């Protein structure tokens, strides 16, 4: 339990946020690898 947990934020969202922060921390030289790791391909069917 923390400020994020038990307040509407899933731990997966926590991981996404910290991973995005780390990727943004990377310089533009290594930004291509960060974009490669970032997966936005999967969409939703409902």
């Amino acid at each position: 339990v923390a400020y994020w947990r038990q307040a509407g934020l899933s731990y997966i969202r926590y991981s996404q946020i910290c991973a995005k922060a780390v990727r943004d921390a990377l310089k533009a030289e290594f930004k291509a690898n960060a974009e490669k790791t970032s997966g936005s391909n999967v969409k939703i069917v409902k």
């Binding site: 997966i12 991981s15 970032s38 997966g39 999967v42 409902k46």
Partner: protein, 272 residues
């Protein structure tokens, strides 16, 4: 048939052969990339599953709910990959429903949705698409796990089905259990493990779910690319065989046409 029909069919089959060979080369390149990317993913998945490998984490008894994760792609022409995973998920659904357990299925591949929607339409929980068009990555798996938790289906017991890559020609449709429930995570082995708590173990289990989803996605994409290459190669071979047969037929028809027209001309000249 006539000369024109043979020519049309032969040209169409030639074009089909060229397209199949080009797709075979494309699938070979994608298979090489997936094979390169699989090794870190393989290590990551083995590490994620190591905790449950070294602990006898087994479901105690019957559970009302059960989620089945059928990992597949949207593209076709993959041979029996989607067929095998669909057969496996159907068998598992029937077996678990025979015990009176509520069965829900999540399919990351539109092909799985199409195959199972004729019968298992209601059991679909959340369907995903655009899988296999680009190499899978941990972001997509994280999104899938996030919406799986957000779906509101608190499955006490879970499992995942995917086609594990064994070799360039061989693959195995493997089933891996998922103990996403916090209570089922706690067992006799967790007594030895320190700082287990409840929330920490819950977050760890969610992250392990994301990790196994990512590992299954990588294995499935490697298997799909290998099978795509093999199927395109077989299609190209069949097209080439048909091409040579039709070429022989076309030569026979061309010679027959020439002979017939010359015979008509000669008969007309002689009857004059």
């Amino acid at each position: 048939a006539t000369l024109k029909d043979i020519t049309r069919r032969l040209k169409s089959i030639k074009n089909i052969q060229k397209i199949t060979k080009s797709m075979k080369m494309v699938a070979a390149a994608k298979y090489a990339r997936a094979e390169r990317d699989l090794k870190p993913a393989r290590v990551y998945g083995i590490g994620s599953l190591a905790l449950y490998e070294k602990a006898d984490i087994k479901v105690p008894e019957d559970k009302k709910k059960h989620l089945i994760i059928g990992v597949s792609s949207d593209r076709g022409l993959c041979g029996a990959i989607h067929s095998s995973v669909a057969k496996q998920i159907k068998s598992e659904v029937a077996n678990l429903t025979a015990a009176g357990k509520e069965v829900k299925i999540v399919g990351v591949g539109d092909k799985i949705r199409g195959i199972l929607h004729r019968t298992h339409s209601d059991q679909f929980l959340v369907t995903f698409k655009e899988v296999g068009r680009k190499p899978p990555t941990f972001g997509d798996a994280s999104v899938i796990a996030l919406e799986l938790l957000n779906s509101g289906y608190e499955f006490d017991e879970g499992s995942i089905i995917f086609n594990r890559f064994r070799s360039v020609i061989s693959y195995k449709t493997e089933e891996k259990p998922i103990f996403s429930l916090d209570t089922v995570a706690s067992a006799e082995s967790m007594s030895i493990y320190d700082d287990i708590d409840a929330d920490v173990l819950r977050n760890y289990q969610e992250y392990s779910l994301a990790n196994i989803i990512y590992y299954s996605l990588k294995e499935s994409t490697t298997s799909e690319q290998s099978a795509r290459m093999t199927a395109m190669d077989n299609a190209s071979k069949n097209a080439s065989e048909m091409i040579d047969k039709l070429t022989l037929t076309f030569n026979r028809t061309r010679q027959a046409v020439i002979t017939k027209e010359l015979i008509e001309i000669i008969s007309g000249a002689a009857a004059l």
